Enzyme design. Structure first.
Site, PDB file in Angstrom:
ATOM      1  N   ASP B 290       0.825  -1.209   0.000  1.00 41.03           N
ATOM      2  CA  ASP B 290       0.000   0.000   0.000  1.00 41.03           C
ATOM      3  C   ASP B 290       0.860   1.261   0.000  1.00 41.03           C
ATOM      4  O   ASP B 290       0.540   2.237  -0.686  1.00 41.03           O
ATOM      5  CB  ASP B 290      -0.955  -0.006   1.196  1.00 41.03           C
ATOM      6  CG  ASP B 290      -2.115  -0.964   1.006  1.00 41.03           C
ATOM      7  OD1 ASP B 290      -2.504  -1.202  -0.156  1.00 41.03           O
ATOM      8  OD2 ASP B 290      -2.633  -1.482   2.017  1.00 41.03           O
ATOM      9  N   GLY B 372      -9.098   1.045  -2.024  1.00 44.87           N
ATOM     10  CA  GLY B 372     -10.027   0.013  -2.460  1.00 44.87           C
ATOM     11  C   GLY B 372     -10.995  -0.351  -1.349  1.00 44.87           C
ATOM     12  O   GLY B 372     -11.765   0.490  -0.865  1.00 44.87           O
ATOM     13  N   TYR B 374     -10.146  -1.616   1.737  1.00 41.49           N
ATOM     14  CA  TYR B 374      -9.623  -1.473   3.083  1.00 41.49           C
ATOM     15  C   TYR B 374      -9.413  -0.024   3.474  1.00 41.49           C
ATOM     16  O   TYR B 374      -9.116   0.880   2.699  1.00 41.49           O
ATOM     17  CB  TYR B 374      -8.266  -2.172   3.318  1.00 41.49           C
ATOM     18  CG  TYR B 374      -8.467  -3.581   3.753  1.00 41.49           C
ATOM     19  CD1 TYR B 374      -8.003  -4.647   2.975  1.00 41.49           C
ATOM     20  CD2 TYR B 374      -9.132  -3.857   4.944  1.00 41.49           C
ATOM     21  CE1 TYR B 374      -8.199  -5.981   3.374  1.00 41.49           C
ATOM     22  CE2 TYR B 374      -9.344  -5.169   5.391  1.00 41.49           C
ATOM     23  CZ  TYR B 374      -8.856  -6.232   4.580  1.00 41.49           C
ATOM     24  OH  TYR B 374      -9.039  -7.550   4.942  1.00 41.49           O
ATOM     25  N   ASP B 375      -9.590   0.212   4.772  1.00 39.80           N
ATOM     26  CA  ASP B 375      -9.382   1.538   5.371  1.00 39.80           C
ATOM     27  C   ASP B 375      -8.466   1.353   6.560  1.00 39.80           C
ATOM     28  O   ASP B 375      -8.701   0.472   7.387  1.00 39.80           O
ATOM     29  CB  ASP B 375     -10.696   2.175   5.822  1.00 39.80           C
ATOM     30  CG  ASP B 375     -11.711   2.242   4.713  1.00 39.80           C
ATOM     31  OD1 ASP B 375     -12.138   1.155   4.277  1.00 39.80           O
ATOM     32  OD2 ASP B 375     -12.064   3.352   4.271  1.00 39.80           O
TER      33      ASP B 375
HETATM   34 CU   LIG Z   1      -7.561  -8.200   6.895  1.00 38.22          CU
END
Ligand SMILES: [Cu+2]
Ligand SMILES: [Cu+2]
Ligand code: NA
Ligand code: NA
Ligand code: NA
Ligand code: NA
Lengths: 620, 620
Positions: B290, B372, B374-375
């Site tokens: 990321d 996407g 996930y935060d």
């Molecule tokens: Cu996870």
């Protein structure tokens, strides 16, 4: 009307009257423990009988007794004489603490030792410590305390800054005899004071801290009914208090739609041991069982609004017995409140355009106890998402010694000539589990690494394995942080909507367990602390991991004897016992008063719910 | 005037103008990274030169460039053409995300796959994911993204509930060619929706939550000067922001009396990798970097008062460059506030009669990013007692797949037919240490158990040992929770009043490191994640544990190549790199939106101060 209600002053007064009329509470008797007994399994007949267990000590040397009383019927149910050389001595009495210093002040050997050091006996405080079981045959069946000396230069002085090393005494507190005085040599008494409220030490106080105001303009979100029954954000539980264990949580359950689903039947810290790692004969016997020997509940603090507990606080004031059977209220001894706990869930979705944020909160139930130099906070937390967490907070003043010229492998230096011996603080949580009912099992879950090869051609796969613990002899387990080891408590007869057994996962902190040699006295008496997890089959009389009478018990009581029964625990009424603790190498920053350090554990739902249980939390 | 000040919109506009005039920013160019360079070591000459590093991509296929610009002088300092098959591709551009779905919608093979599944191409969302380096020789030197498909039933639908398993495509985003479409078979698309704001799923929202009001009637205790310089309760630091790393902390120091004492020169999360453990060829390539591939700072959220940040909040709004060199403000992207943190220190002394309680607080610096599904929240905490802590908060929506009939060893079932592959979230904290200055060393500290015997006759003693790490080749270390292993960063030339070197102790959470086979592509590209601790000698160009160009880099860049220099780290300018992460086996409770889970680390003073540093805290 609830059978789990707190003991009342009226109940304790009735117990006193029942004992007195039965001839069991004469002037030579002292109550060393008094507490309410939990309802037996299957109390669904409403035939409620409030029963109390009492340990009665005799200051004239007669045998002590264990007595059970029914307050509702006004009767003595049983009374047994105790052979303390066999089954252990009774817990230490508050009034025996002062006896030690008073007896030493008139003992010729003690006075000679103080005279050699030019110490005024009127300024010498003696810490009265539990004795354990070591090599002294004359101590078997006698109530012994050991004393270590500290100098108080003036009435408000912190004596802990001035240990008198090289000197220890043993005292028989019933016969009022000093049995041994051991003087291994003169150490300088460290001279710097440790007075953390003295402006000379603190300097000018900061003026930079602006207030933080936490208020609840509509009052708290929880309700308290029947004195100690709490409902909060789908949680339901009863808050108990016992003079030995402190706060006890009963009947922890979660309202899932129209169903009240049990999770934990009883949760408590059932023992805590503080073993010291200094091999000097002055301290090599030093091991506190704060719960089993001293009873942490009776030293609970009264907690002050704005200082100890901040926010919209609801207090409980539990009632205990004093040594004569009179009720004694611990005013504001338990604080309850809710706290904001940051973000609960958040997502900003590119495709849907929906931005979503929800906040978390937790319910806090806490008390603080003070035993000598140490102060411990016990915190239970319930979270919106079904997580249950325990946290212990350790503070107070570290126990001190001289710092030897030429150093030490077992003692930290805190100030010129002032040492602090290495030690641990180890807790045992007893979790009488009831995941969706009483048919439970424990699985050990490890991460599984996989080798690159057929079926895993890119070498990225990993998995997990679960091992069911089926009998008590295989249910003594060790941590393995490297393999991500956790334990799952599940109900094999209660399935979620995916047809998997409902469960909760225990997450440990994976701190070191008991460091002492396995052949030591402390390893035998605190066998529970040598392993991270034990699972037993529930039994009424298996209450403490160290047994009922910990003081001067020779060893092997409690969990090692329970698990020898090798009972079936695969889908049965089981109890989880989790060992966790802090290993403390004192630092300079711990002196002269220690900033809080913490340790704990938590349990999180694992397919207990059919989806996230916090979808109905509003956007505040 | 501070050289550590945040980049301004004016600085970014000047960079754009300098690049344009130099002929480096034509219509075919895109800025893939832009950030300010830290001052070089020994900037005590006031000769401040604000320099920016820029990665420039070319959408026509020409070689990209790395360029350094001086804003103060208005000059290009250097400009190098990059051979991306050798040194790696540039980070993914936001505008390339949409390219993937658009290209697949006109590809005959993709349309045939969707037709076989009776899916309307207008409803199929494609997640554009980084490619990694695997077996496809035609990808070397090309910019590839891989796409996985999800169905959106209507514009506000959560597509994550409807994965299209068995199907993956690879896309060259420069030539605009679909290179491969792989269809391994038809899986049913899971039909249940995952719309966590739909009343049908949430039920009626709770009405039981009463408000918690946190206010500061006199304002906060910290001050902000020069835009980003913070002073709070003896702490001093500068808050930076970089589009790759996010929030960066500079010049962390503590005012000890009259001395401002440095502790950490630069702290950041310098990489984070999310490797997936599903061996299906549809996902066995899936690994997010990321930070290095996507740049977490550019997806920072604007944080809402009362929802994301509660209390008396001070915001910073950092400025970044868009792909054309225009300044873009992230409004309210960083929240700063102080929080009450319970009891700091407490003791009730029987002998002195003094009751003492002080409360703790912490300073919070945080931001949130969304990539996407996930935060992630990044939280830095400073405590009154000198503790520094980092916490990552993971939430958002889990990445999904079909759940295979007959089960899986590598995928959890969340709903009928809906799976969630096992994965990890692993972070690298880069700590450029400066404990009382730049001459530092690292010691590994283990608990030492001792055998009962002479000098330890009661078998109670335990100790500890410290091992100095002297060269980089011996400074790659693993956790050992069973031995209580920690690492101490000390300054051997700066002693406390007891003549011991001042230090700070790093406490890890001891979670599992990278699980993938050591021969895998991900183990080579994320070598940092296979070990808990690395120590390197400081060097200007050694910024990231994975190297400068992570996207489609074949492996071995970053830490494994740095430590081959085997440099002296014993009392030198050193950098600590700590790996920590979560291993995620998704549970039913993580669906349809995941409650926060956390991981982190902390550093506590270890003889840094001459006594407790919080004696001057007032009794509020
Ligand atoms: Cu996870
Ligand atoms: Cu301690
Ligand atoms: Na015995
Ligand atoms: Na049970
Ligand atoms: Na290469
Ligand atoms: Na450094």
């Amino acid at each position: 009307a609830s059978p789990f209600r707190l003991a009342s002053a009226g109940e304790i007064s009735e117990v006193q009257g029942i004992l007195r009329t039965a001839g069991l509470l004469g002037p030579e008797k002292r109550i060393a423990y008094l507490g309410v007994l939990d309802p037996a399994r299957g109390a669904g007949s409403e035939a409620e009988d409030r029963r109390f267990r009492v340990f009665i000590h005799d200051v004239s040397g007669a045998r002590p007794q264990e007595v059970t009383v029914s307050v509702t019927n006004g009767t003595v149910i049983s009374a047994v004489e105790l052979d303390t050389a066999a089954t252990g001595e009774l817990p230490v009495l508050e009034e025996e603490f002062e006896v030690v210093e008073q007896l030493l002040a008139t003992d010729e050997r003690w006075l000679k030792a103080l005279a050699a050091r030019n110490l005024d006996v009127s300024k010498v405080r003696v810490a009265p410590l539990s004795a354990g079981v070591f090599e002294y045959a004359e101590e078997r069946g006698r109530r012994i305390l050991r004393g270590l000396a500290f100098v108080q230069d003036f009435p408000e002085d912190s004596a802990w800054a001035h240990p008198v090393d090289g000197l220890v005494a043993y005292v028989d507190v019933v016969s009022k005899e000093v049995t041994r005085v051991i003087d291994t040599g003169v150490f300088p008494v460290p001279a710097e004071h440790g007075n953390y409220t003295d402006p000379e030490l603190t300097g000018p106080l900061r003026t930079t801290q602006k207030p933080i105001s936490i208020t609840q303009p509509e009052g708290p979100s929880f309700t308290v009914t029947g004195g100690n029954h709490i409902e909060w954000e789908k949680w339901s539980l009863d808050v108990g208090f016992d003079v030995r264990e402190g706060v006890v949580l009963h009947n922890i359950a979660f309202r899932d739609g129209d169903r009240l689903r049990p999770i934990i039947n009883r949760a408590s810290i059932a023992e805590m041991v503080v073993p010291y790692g200094d091999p000097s004969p002055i301290r090599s016997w030093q091991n506190y069982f704060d719960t089993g020997e001293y009873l942490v509940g009776q030293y609970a603090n009264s907690l002050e609004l704005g200082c100890d507990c901040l926010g919209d606080i609801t207090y409980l004031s539990p009632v205990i017995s004093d040594a004569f059977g009179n009720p004694r209220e611990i005013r504001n001894g338990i604080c309850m409140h809710e706290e904001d706990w940051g973000i609960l869930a958040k997502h900003s979705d590119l495709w849907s355009g929906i931005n979503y944020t929800r906040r978390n909160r937790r319910m806090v139930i806490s008390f603080f106890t003070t035993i000598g130099n140490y102060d411990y906070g016990f915190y239970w937390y319930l979270y919106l998402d079904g997580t249950i967490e325990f946290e212990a907070k350790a503070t107070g003043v570290v126990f001190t010694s001289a710092f030897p010229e030429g150093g030490s492998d077992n003692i930290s230096q805190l100030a010129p000539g002032l040492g602090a011996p290495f030690h641990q603080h180890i807790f045992s949580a007893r979790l009488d589990m009831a995941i969706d009912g009483f048919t439970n099992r424990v699985e050990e879950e490890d991460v599984v690494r996989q080798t690159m090869g057929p079926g895993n051609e890119r070498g990225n796969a990993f998995s997990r394995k679960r091992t069911v613990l089926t009998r008590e002899s295989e249910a003594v387990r060790e941590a393995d942080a490297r393999t991500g080891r956790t334990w799952i408590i599940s109900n094999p007869e209660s399935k979620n909507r995916l047809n998997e057994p409902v469960g909760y996962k225990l997450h440990a902190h994976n701190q070191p367990t008991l460091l002492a040699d396995p052949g030591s006295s402390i390893a035998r008496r605190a066998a529970f602390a040598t392993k991270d997890l034990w699972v037993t089959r529930y039994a009424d009389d298996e209450r403490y991991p160290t047994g009922d009478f910990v003081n001067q018990h020779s060893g092997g009581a409690g969990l090692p004897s329970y698990i020898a029964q090798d009972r079936d625990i695969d889908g049965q009424d089981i109890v989880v016992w989790h060992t966790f603790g802090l290993t403390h190498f004192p630092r300079v920053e711990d002196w002269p008063i220690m900033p809080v350090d913490t340790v704990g554990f938590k349990l999180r739902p694992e397919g207990f719910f059919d989806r996230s249980p916090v979808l109905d939390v509003p956007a505040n």
